[PDB]
Amino acid sequence: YELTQPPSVSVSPGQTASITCSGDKLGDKYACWYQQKPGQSPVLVIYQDSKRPSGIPERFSGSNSGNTATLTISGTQAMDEADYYCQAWDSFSTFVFGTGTKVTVLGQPKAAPSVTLFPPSSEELQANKATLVCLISDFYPGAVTVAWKADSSPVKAGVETTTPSKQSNNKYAASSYLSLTPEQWKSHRSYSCQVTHEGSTVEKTVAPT
């Protein structure tokens, strides 16, 4: 038994966002709302259908009627790019949460990614290991594609890349790791990491010295 809410909601800055939590029935049941930013634990944004806790701003209101509870965000801002959960009991009568809702304020400024390529340090070399570290940050939106090369030739395997993640400045952040063996590092003219972002692409290059 679970409360269904959409997994996606789309919004531009300053417009109004509405999220729907839904069971059978509701209203006669009290629906509260929790907000969860990535990496952090949730925080009460709504309790008892319409009320709001202390430390939550004017622009946060939720309603409840028939078979649908809702939450409305007047003048949606960049501070509100989190997940949103519903809660009731239903119906035996332990507690149950929503399925999760992803708000997104788009129409935000673009930003070319700043890339930084670190070569394998000394320790790892003096430990029969090598790993190249490509670091991508300060970039919006977060739809990147990473490709490695040795000399001019494109590296094939031994490559592992993270999945785009949010930051602090309401941006994104990624990393790429090239798993090598010390000869492959010492026996080449150069290694390079190329990050592709929409159309703009940025490379970085290092060489054994």
Binding site: Y30, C32, Y34, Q40, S41, P42, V43, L44, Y47, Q48, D49, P53, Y85, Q87, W89, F92, T94, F95, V96, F97, G98, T99, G100, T116, F118, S121, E123, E124, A127, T131, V133, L135, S137, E160, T161, T162, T163, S165, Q167, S168, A173, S175, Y177, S179
Partner: protein
């Protein structure tokens, strides 16, 4: 009110997960004390709550399984289960629920969450190497590589560096282990005249490293 959860980071299957939450003020007997879990993939689920009288209430599908205890002399309460299986991996929060009760139940004040992974595999301490800078702003970092399980905390100069610092999420590499890297952007000029230290803390293996980064 402050809540802090502590317990193991790793529990092998079919054993007994043991967690403890610790509360500050409130005060006690103003709140029911509940536990909530959230798998890393996605999803939030409630398991049970307890009151200082000893009276309890658990999630039905998880009764005969979960057991919540309480000690009102040291302001803490605990969880056990059970026989833990492989699909109980989640972030566990202690949480509060108003007295009365408040039939329109809601969870005000949560913990920060403790990630408990369950696997037949064993734990592994990290191998941390320096991402030395050089060469108006330089960037230097700490590579926490091949460790298990999540999470690992990375600070700088005992938490003195909050500016220009970013810690990245881990990556599950072919080995089946985790690895991540943290970076900091500082003035170039300063380099040579200054010391930089990444403070790595990996609790499930109880190890604590403090690597030192200096330019090439």
């Amino acid at each position: 009110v402050q809540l802090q959860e502590s317990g193991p980071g790793l529990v092998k299957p079919s054993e007994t997960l043991s967690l403890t939450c610790t509360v500050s003020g409130g005060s006690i007997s103003s709140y029911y004390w509940s536990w909530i879990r959230q798998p890393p993939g996605k999803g939030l689920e409630w398991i049970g709550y307890i009151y200082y009288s000893g009276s309890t209430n658990y999630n039905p599908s998880l009764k005969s399984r979960v057991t919540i205890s309480v000690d009102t002399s040291k302001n803490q309460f605990s969880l056990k289960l059970s026989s833990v299986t492989a699909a109980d991996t989640a972030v566990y929060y202690c949480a509060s629920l108003p007295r009365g009760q408040l039939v329109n139940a809601y969870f005000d004040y949560w913990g920060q969450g403790t990630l408990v992974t369950v696997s037949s595999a064993s734990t592994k301490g990290p191998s941390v190497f320096p991402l030395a800078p050089s060469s108006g702003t330089a960037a230097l970092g700490c590579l926490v590589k091949d460790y298990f399980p999540e999470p690992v905390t990375v600070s700088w100069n005992s938490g003195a560096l909050t500016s220009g610092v970013h810690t990245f999420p881990a990556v599950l590499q072919s080995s089946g282990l985790y690895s991540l890297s943290s970076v900091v952007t500082v003035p170039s000029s300063s380099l040579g005249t200054q010391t930089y230290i990444c403070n790595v803390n990996h609790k499930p293996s109880n190890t604590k490293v403090d690597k030192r980064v200096e330019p090439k």
